[model samples]
Target: ATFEIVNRCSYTVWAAASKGDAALDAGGRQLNSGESWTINVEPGTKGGKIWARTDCYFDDSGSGICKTGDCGGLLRCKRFGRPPTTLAEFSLNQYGKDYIDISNIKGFNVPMDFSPTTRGCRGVRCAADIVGQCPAKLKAPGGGCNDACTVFQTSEYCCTTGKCGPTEYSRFFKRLCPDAFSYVLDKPTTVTCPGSSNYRVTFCPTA
Candidate 1:
């Protein structure tokens, strides 16, 4: 029999086939939001499974201020896997709260390119690792603009330069995976980003 797999999520999903108790192998083409696929299943395909994985990205433009555009930074905000799964029986804010048991599938890929220009400085300098380094200037009374500076520092002098202190890497981790596994997949899964607002879920049958 054949089954049609559909994605209702906003982000793209990489799907692969897994044999009985074995790891997932690359299968069909990638699938985008609102896309479907037909799969043929044998009479007795046991232990077969399908998996989906996504790469999480972060944006500093949100409420909080970040030193760099690159999400790999220590204190930047991040969301694990684009187009997060919608809340049905699970909580959206805390998707990985309990053990989701995501098979043996690896997590998504993160861009390694770190652009220094995009990361502005406040009183802290943006380090190569994307973390914040407090410069000696910030220690001065007027280093951070004295009383004229806003409480929420968004300027380059207060963000990327040397006005900030060492940010906690845990902040990014906490925002991405509350209690989920963080790793990259061995192979690329078929998926597409349709630029929408829906969390798609795809599953394949394996033997």
Candidate 2:
């Protein structure tokens, strides 16, 4: 299936994705407002992650650092992006269904929508003004909000023992983005679609 990533933010965003060990679209590309990039994912691809970086500058070699969502300082990411990054997660054609979800488990950078363009499947979005309402302690230096897990790393927030529940911080994100995975076990937000469906991941989607 193909995934189209659209940048609707007023500023530039460097889009990145990873399907297993393979990076999509040479790992990432610079998209100004109103620009987009498309990627073709093989069937049965699992645990694919897509995110956007802000305020980045890359050299001709396609290497640089970003204010948010940097992946080892490489434009063509060789690994998952750093934490405090908004994530569009999916597993295509997994047991005859394609699963998709928006996650703020690491934190939130840009508002996003993950929708199936072809099928009748419903869309999920997290477009609240989270950055503006972020708790002062969880605010990232570059911008965006940091999840409690990333900021504290405590078992209470990280679910390290597999027996944790939501915290005040997780609730904060949940209140703003009810359809997203606010914590590790936020499962009801996960949605599924047909394997034949194409998808769109929009950054900075409106409410």
The number of residue pairs in model 2 that clash at the backbone is 0
Q: What are the per-residue Cα lDDT tens digits for candidate 1 across 12-109? A: 54433334333222232245665776554342333333333333222453222221111222121122111111111111112222111221111112
lDDT of 2 by residue, 1-207 (tens): 888999999989999998647786577889999998988877888899999998888999988898899988888876788777889999888888889899999899999999998965898899999999999999999988999988898998999988888889999999999999999876578888887678999999873
Which runs of model 1 end up more than 4 angstroms from their true locations? 20-26, 56-207
lDDT, model 1, position 130: 12
Instruction: Show where candidate 2 strays beyond 4 Å.
Output: none
lDDT for residue 103 in candidate 1, whole number 0-100 = 16
Cα lDDT computed for each candidate against the true fold: 0.26, 0.88
